[PDB]
mmCIF file with all atom_site columns, all heavy atoms in Angstrom:
data_model
loop_
_atom_site.group_PDB
_atom_site.id
_atom_site.type_symbol
_atom_site.label_atom_id
_atom_site.label_alt_id
_atom_site.label_comp_id
_atom_site.label_asym_id
_atom_site.label_entity_id
_atom_site.label_seq_id
_atom_site.pdbx_PDB_ins_code
_atom_site.Cartn_x
_atom_site.Cartn_y
_atom_site.Cartn_z
_atom_site.occupancy
_atom_site.B_iso_or_equiv
_atom_site.pdbx_formal_charge
_atom_site.auth_seq_id
_atom_site.auth_comp_id
_atom_site.auth_asym_id
_atom_site.auth_atom_id
_atom_site.pdbx_PDB_model_num
ATOM 1   N N   . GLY A 1 4  ? 92.986 101.283 105.882 1.00 53.92 ? 4  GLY A N   1
ATOM 2   C CA  . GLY A 1 4  ? 92.327 101.704 104.653 1.00 53.92 ? 4  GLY A CA  1
ATOM 3   C C   . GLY A 1 4  ? 91.570 100.569 104.011 1.00 53.92 ? 4  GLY A C   1
ATOM 4   O O   . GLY A 1 4  ? 90.454 100.777 103.531 1.00 53.92 ? 4  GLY A O   1
ATOM 5   N N   . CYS A 1 5  ? 92.185 99.369  103.994 1.00 52.30 ? 5  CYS A N   1
ATOM 6   C CA  . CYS A 1 5  ? 91.598 98.141  103.431 1.00 52.30 ? 5  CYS A CA  1
ATOM 7   C C   . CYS A 1 5  ? 91.185 98.353  101.964 1.00 52.30 ? 5  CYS A C   1
ATOM 8   O O   . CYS A 1 5  ? 90.091 98.853  101.656 1.00 52.30 ? 5  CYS A O   1
ATOM 9   C CB  . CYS A 1 5  ? 90.398 97.645  104.259 1.00 52.30 ? 5  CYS A CB  1
ATOM 10  S SG  . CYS A 1 5  ? 90.847 96.485  105.580 1.00 52.30 ? 5  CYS A SG  1
ATOM 11  N N   . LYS A 1 6  ? 92.089 97.967  101.036 1.00 51.80 ? 6  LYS A N   1
ATOM 12  C CA  . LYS A 1 6  ? 91.828 98.097  99.594  1.00 51.80 ? 6  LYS A CA  1
ATOM 13  C C   . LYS A 1 6  ? 90.913 96.967  99.104  1.00 51.80 ? 6  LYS A C   1
ATOM 14  O O   . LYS A 1 6  ? 89.744 97.186  98.802  1.00 51.80 ? 6  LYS A O   1
ATOM 15  C CB  . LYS A 1 6  ? 93.176 98.115  98.838  1.00 51.80 ? 6  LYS A CB  1
ATOM 16  C CG  . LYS A 1 6  ? 93.114 98.878  97.533  1.00 51.80 ? 6  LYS A CG  1
ATOM 17  C CD  . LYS A 1 6  ? 94.461 98.857  96.813  1.00 51.80 ? 6  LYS A CD  1
ATOM 18  C CE  . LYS A 1 6  ? 94.393 99.604  95.482  1.00 51.80 ? 6  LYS A CE  1
ATOM 19  N NZ  . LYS A 1 6  ? 95.711 99.578  94.779  1.00 51.80 ? 6  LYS A NZ  1
ATOM 20  N N   . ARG A 1 7  ? 91.477 95.756  99.024  1.00 54.07 ? 7  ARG A N   1
ATOM 21  C CA  . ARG A 1 7  ? 90.737 94.568  98.576  1.00 54.07 ? 7  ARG A CA  1
ATOM 22  C C   . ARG A 1 7  ? 90.761 93.497  99.697  1.00 54.07 ? 7  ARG A C   1
ATOM 23  O O   . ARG A 1 7  ? 90.147 93.706  100.747 1.00 54.07 ? 7  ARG A O   1
ATOM 24  C CB  . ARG A 1 7  ? 91.335 94.049  97.244  1.00 54.07 ? 7  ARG A CB  1
ATOM 25  C CG  . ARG A 1 7  ? 90.600 92.842  96.647  1.00 54.07 ? 7  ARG A CG  1
ATOM 26  C CD  . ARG A 1 7  ? 90.845 92.729  95.153  1.00 54.07 ? 7  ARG A CD  1
ATOM 27  N NE  . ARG A 1 7  ? 90.117 91.605  94.556  1.00 54.07 ? 7  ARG A NE  1
ATOM 28  C CZ  . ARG A 1 7  ? 90.012 91.349  93.257  1.00 54.07 ? 7  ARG A CZ  1
ATOM 29  N NH1 . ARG A 1 7  ? 90.600 92.137  92.358  1.00 54.07 ? 7  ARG A NH1 1
ATOM 30  N NH2 . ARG A 1 7  ? 89.320 90.312  92.838  1.00 54.07 ? 7  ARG A NH2 1
ATOM 31  N N   . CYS A 1 8  ? 91.469 92.380  99.478  1.00 52.18 ? 8  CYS A N   1
ATOM 32  C CA  . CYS A 1 8  ? 91.596 91.319  100.457 1.00 52.18 ? 8  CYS A CA  1
ATOM 33  C C   . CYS A 1 8  ? 92.983 90.688  100.385 1.00 52.18 ? 8  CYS A C   1
ATOM 34  O O   . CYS A 1 8  ? 93.342 90.048  99.402  1.00 52.18 ? 8  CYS A O   1
ATOM 35  C CB  . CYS A 1 8  ? 90.535 90.242  100.310 1.00 52.18 ? 8  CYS A CB  1
ATOM 36  S SG  . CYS A 1 8  ? 90.513 89.029  101.675 1.00 52.18 ? 8  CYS A SG  1
ATOM 37  N N   . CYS A 1 9  ? 93.764 90.906  101.451 1.00 53.01 ? 9  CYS A N   1
ATOM 38  C CA  . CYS A 1 9  ? 95.119 90.383  101.542 1.00 53.01 ? 9  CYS A CA  1
ATOM 39  C C   . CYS A 1 9  ? 95.319 89.482  102.723 1.00 53.01 ? 9  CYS A C   1
ATOM 40  O O   . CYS A 1 9  ? 95.802 88.350  102.598 1.00 53.01 ? 9  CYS A O   1
ATOM 41  C CB  . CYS A 1 9  ? 96.113 91.557  101.577 1.00 53.01 ? 9  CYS A CB  1
ATOM 42  S SG  . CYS A 1 9  ? 96.548 92.190  99.938  1.00 53.01 ? 9  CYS A SG  1
ATOM 43  N N   . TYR A 1 10 ? 94.935 89.964  103.921 1.00 54.73 ? 10 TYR A N   1
ATOM 44  C CA  . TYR A 1 10 ? 95.077 89.218  105.181 1.00 54.73 ? 10 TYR A CA  1
ATOM 45  C C   . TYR A 1 10 ? 94.250 89.834  106.312 1.00 54.73 ? 10 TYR A C   1
ATOM 46  O O   . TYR A 1 10 ? 93.614 90.881  106.117 1.00 54.73 ? 10 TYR A O   1
ATOM 47  C CB  . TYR A 1 10 ? 96.555 89.210  105.604 1.00 54.73 ? 10 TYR A CB  1
ATOM 48  C CG  . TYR A 1 10 ? 97.220 87.858  105.499 1.00 54.73 ? 10 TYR A CG  1
ATOM 49  C CD1 . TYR A 1 10 ? 98.001 87.528  104.402 1.00 54.73 ? 10 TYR A CD1 1
ATOM 50  C CD2 . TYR A 1 10 ? 97.077 86.906  106.504 1.00 54.73 ? 10 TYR A CD2 1
ATOM 51  C CE1 . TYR A 1 10 ? 98.621 86.285  104.308 1.00 54.73 ? 10 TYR A CE1 1
ATOM 52  C CE2 . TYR A 1 10 ? 97.677 85.669  106.413 1.00 54.73 ? 10 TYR A CE2 1
ATOM 53  C CZ  . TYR A 1 10 ? 98.457 85.371  105.319 1.00 54.73 ? 10 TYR A CZ  1
ATOM 54  O OH  . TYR A 1 10 ? 99.071 84.143  105.241 1.00 54.73 ? 10 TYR A OH  1
ATOM 55  N N   . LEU A 1 11 ? 94.229 89.172  107.467 1.00 52.83 ? 11 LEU A N   1
ATOM 56  C CA  . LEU A 1 11 ? 93.526 89.652  108.645 1.00 52.83 ? 11 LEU A CA  1
ATOM 57  C C   . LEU A 1 11 ? 94.461 89.615  109.843 1.00 52.83 ? 11 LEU A C   1
ATOM 58  O O   . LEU A 1 11 ? 94.844 88.529  110.303 1.00 52.83 ? 11 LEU A O   1
ATOM 59  C CB  . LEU A 1 11 ? 92.270 88.803  108.887 1.00 52.83 ? 11 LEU A CB  1
ATOM 60  C CG  . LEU A 1 11 ? 91.321 88.731  107.700 1.00 52.83 ? 11 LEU A CG  1
ATOM 61  C CD1 . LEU A 1 11 ? 90.421 87.511  107.818 1.00 52.83 ? 11 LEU A CD1 1
ATOM 62  C CD2 . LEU A 1 11 ? 90.457 89.991  107.602 1.00 52.83 ? 11 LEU A CD2 1
ATOM 63  N N   . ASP A 1 12 ? 94.806 90.793  110.359 1.00 47.63 ? 12 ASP A N   1
ATOM 64  C CA  . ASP A 1 12 ? 95.743 90.907  111.480 1.00 47.63 ? 12 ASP A CA  1
ATOM 65  C C   . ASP A 1 12 ? 95.040 90.798  112.847 1.00 47.63 ? 12 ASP A C   1
ATOM 66  O O   . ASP A 1 12 ? 95.143 89.761  113.515 1.00 47.63 ? 12 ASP A O   1
ATOM 67  C CB  . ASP A 1 12 ? 96.526 92.216  111.359 1.00 47.63 ? 12 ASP A CB  1
ATOM 68  C CG  . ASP A 1 12 ? 97.925 92.118  111.995 1.00 47.63 ? 12 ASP A CG  1
ATOM 69  O OD1 . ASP A 1 12 ? 98.847 91.691  111.274 1.00 47.63 ? 12 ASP A OD1 1
ATOM 70  O OD2 . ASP A 1 12 ? 98.060 92.467  113.184 1.00 47.63 ? 12 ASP A OD2 1
ATOM 71  N N   . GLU A 1 13 ? 94.334 91.862  113.262 1.00 46.17 ? 13 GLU A N   1
ATOM 72  C CA  . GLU A 1 13 ? 93.657 91.879  114.564 1.00 46.17 ? 13 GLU A CA  1
ATOM 73  C C   . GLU A 1 13 ? 92.156 92.083  114.418 1.00 46.17 ? 13 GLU A C   1
ATOM 74  O O   . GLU A 1 13 ? 91.355 91.177  114.708 1.00 46.17 ? 13 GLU A O   1
ATOM 75  C CB  . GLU A 1 13 ? 94.272 92.957  115.472 1.00 46.17 ? 13 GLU A CB  1
ATOM 76  C CG  . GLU A 1 13 ? 94.430 92.517  116.897 1.00 46.17 ? 13 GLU A CG  1
ATOM 77  C CD  . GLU A 1 13 ? 94.993 93.619  117.782 1.00 46.17 ? 13 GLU A CD  1
ATOM 78  O OE1 . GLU A 1 13 ? 96.246 93.697  117.909 1.00 46.17 ? 13 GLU A OE1 1
ATOM 79  O OE2 . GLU A 1 13 ? 94.201 94.395  118.362 1.00 46.17 ? 13 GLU A OE2 1
ATOM 80  N N   . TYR A 1 14 ? 91.781 93.267  113.932 1.00 48.00 ? 14 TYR A N   1
ATOM 81  C CA  . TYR A 1 14 ? 90.369 93.626  113.724 1.00 48.00 ? 14 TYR A CA  1
ATOM 82  C C   . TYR A 1 14 ? 89.868 93.091  112.387 1.00 48.00 ? 14 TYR A C   1
ATOM 83  O O   . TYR A 1 14 ? 88.652 92.934  112.188 1.00 48.00 ? 14 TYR A O   1
ATOM 84  C CB  . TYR A 1 14 ? 90.195 95.156  113.764 1.00 48.00 ? 14 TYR A CB  1
ATOM 85  C CG  . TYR A 1 14 ? 90.385 95.754  115.155 1.00 48.00 ? 14 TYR A CG  1
ATOM 86  C CD1 . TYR A 1 14 ? 91.652 96.155  115.580 1.00 48.00 ? 14 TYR A CD1 1
ATOM 87  C CD2 . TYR A 1 14 ? 89.321 95.909  116.019 1.00 48.00 ? 14 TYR A CD2 1
ATOM 88  C CE1 . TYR A 1 14 ? 91.830 96.691  116.830 1.00 48.00 ? 14 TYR A CE1 1
ATOM 89  C CE2 . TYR A 1 14 ? 89.495 96.459  117.266 1.00 48.00 ? 14 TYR A CE2 1
ATOM 90  C CZ  . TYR A 1 14 ? 90.759 96.835  117.679 1.00 48.00 ? 14 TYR A CZ  1
ATOM 91  O OH  . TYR A 1 14 ? 90.928 97.379  118.933 1.00 48.00 ? 14 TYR A OH  1
ATOM 92  N N   . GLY A 1 15 ? 90.814 92.810  111.485 1.00 51.71 ? 15 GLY A N   1
ATOM 93  C CA  . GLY A 1 15 ? 90.478 92.280  110.167 1.00 51.71 ? 15 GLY A CA  1
ATOM 94  C C   . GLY A 1 15 ? 90.736 93.264  109.048 1.00 51.71 ? 15 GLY A C   1
ATOM 95  O O   . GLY A 1 15 ? 90.044 93.224  108.016 1.00 51.71 ? 15 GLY A O   1
ATOM 96  N N   . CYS A 1 16 ? 91.719 94.145  109.239 1.00 48.16 ? 16 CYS A N   1
ATOM 97  C CA  . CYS A 1 16 ? 92.075 95.148  108.239 1.00 48.16 ? 16 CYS A CA  1
ATOM 98  C C   . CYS A 1 16 ? 93.582 95.287  108.087 1.00 48.16 ? 16 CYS A C   1
ATOM 99  O O   . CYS A 1 16 ? 94.293 95.482  109.081 1.00 48.16 ? 16 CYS A O   1
ATOM 100 C CB  . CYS A 1 16 ? 91.454 96.514  108.566 1.00 48.16 ? 16 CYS A CB  1
ATOM 101 S SG  . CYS A 1 16 ? 91.399 97.665  107.137 1.00 48.16 ? 16 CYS A SG  1
#
Side-chain angles (χ1 to χ4, degrees):
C5 270
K6 208 181 179 180
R7 184 158 181 171
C8 188
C9 276
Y10 249 99
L11 305 157
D12 210 87
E13 220 182 270
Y14 291 89
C16 198

